[PDB]
């Protein structure tokens, strides 16, 4: 099944995605708007699962249920291209990603074995207001689509997708945004992960990265060495009093991109207020007391699959970085120093927004995984990575 490049995606047919309100691969789009109308009748009954499986909405406020979801994902969610590392989203992270303002329990859509109640599938929706070119639309973000390794290739993923679609339709929402490492009809933008080594000794030892064979280990560590403390004047962790100005800075900064979130002040608090081992946000408060810039990154460690009891690969993911007075190059240099100080092994960033202006300069290396962005039921021109201004978890 899965195609990872648009060349190989052109050489195949999509039994499920051809039935969905998305553009065809290779269709060049010059219009802007829905593929199909809002529905004034929505199917009241859940879609049929294969015999022996049943739907269950996951109440994550139940500690036992949250652990079941953590375990499903820890054992069956996204792996790297070589099946050496698997995302290890923490339970507290999952609460952050899955209970933002406006979350709904019916949108934490699980699949369980009927007889044993074992959790074997999941998909989620959370609400988001999305600015796409000249339109703002209430949408959902879809995330954490996961089918147990023992249930794979049994066409359960289309049922999960149709069911969350139905459950979102019931709430009057008819567009969605989502990302995937695979190519489907039809990316609105294609982004690439880059990686900045922070602890190269460990990255090479777990074979996340490789010694250039013309470089010694000693020389690699000198290459990637960073200052012990950040250089930007007035940098400090975001505090409650910074919520309004962070909201103001973000809103004005995102206007320059073509696919962005539109966050309320309560949403800004949720996504940026620091939570240890989940989300870090630092603001620049200058000599006048004014907050002029901020950087942020989230915590997403990964199981080392070939050595399971060893300490996970600790990765920080660039989130939103807003500059109005500090040069973005300096802000991101301080992001690296802070991630290093907090024990991260690698700092990851996509090539979206203005990130290409600093990636090579700050010694990021290009990754092997593309991140495709998609809209459901919204046909619009595609855009280059540097116009994508949306980062998901």
């Amino acid at each position: 099944g899965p195609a990872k490049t648009m060349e190989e995606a052109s050489k195949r047919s999509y039994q499920f995605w051809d039935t969905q309100p998305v553009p065809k691969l290779g269709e060049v789009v010059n219009t802007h708007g829905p593929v199909e109308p809002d529905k004034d009748n929505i199917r009241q009954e859940p879609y049929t699962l294969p015999q022996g499986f049943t739907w269950d909405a996951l109440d994550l406020g139940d500690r036992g249920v949250l652990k079941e979801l953590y375990t499903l994902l820890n054992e069956n969610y996204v792996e790297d291209d070589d099946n050496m590392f698997r995302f290890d989203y923490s339970p507290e992270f999952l609460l952050w990603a899955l209970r933002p303002p406006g979350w709904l329990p019916q949108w934490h859509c699980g699949v369980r074995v009927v007889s044993s109640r074992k959790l074997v599938g999941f998909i989620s929706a959370i609400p988001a207001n999305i600015h796409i070119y000249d339109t703002e639309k209430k949408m959902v973000e879809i995330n954490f689509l996961c089918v147990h390794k023992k249930l794979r290739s049994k066409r359960v993923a289309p049922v999960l997708i149709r069911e969350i679609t139905r459950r979102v339709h019931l709430e009057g929402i008819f567009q969605a945004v989502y990302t995937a490492g695979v190519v489907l009809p039809k990316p609105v933008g294609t982004c690439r992960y880059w990686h900045r080594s922070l602890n190269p000794r460990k990255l090479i030892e777990v074979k996340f990265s490789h010694l250039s064979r013309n470089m010694t280990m000693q020389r690699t560590m000198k290459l990637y060495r960073l200052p012990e403390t950040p250089k930007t004047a007035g940098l400090r962790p975001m505090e409650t009093k910074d919520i309004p100005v962070v909201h103001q800075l973000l809103t004005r900064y995102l206007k320059q991109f073509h696919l962005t979130p539109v966050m309320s002040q309560e949403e800004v608090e949720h996504w940026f207020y620091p939570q240890e081992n989940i989300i870090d946000t630092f603001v620049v408060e200058n000599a006048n007391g004014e907050v002029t810039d901020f950087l942020s990154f989230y915590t997403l460690p990964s199981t080392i699959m070939n050595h399971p009891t060893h300490k996970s690969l600790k990765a920080a993911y660039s989130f939103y970085n807003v500059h109005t007075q500090t040069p973005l190059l300096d802000l991101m240099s301080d992001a690296l120093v802070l991630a290093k100080m907090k024990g991260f092994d690698v700092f990851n960033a996509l090539d979206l927004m203005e990130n290409k202006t600093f990636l090579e300069k700050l010694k990021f290396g290009i990754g092997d995984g593309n991140l495709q962005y998609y809209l459901y039921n919204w046909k619009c021109p595609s855009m280059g990575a540097e116009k994508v201004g949306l980062v998901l978890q």
Binding site: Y77, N143, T179, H195, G369, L392
Partner: peptide, 10 residues
Amino acid sequence: GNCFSKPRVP
């Protein structure tokens, strides 16, 4: 969902 990437090898 998100995707897992690692440094491209020459």
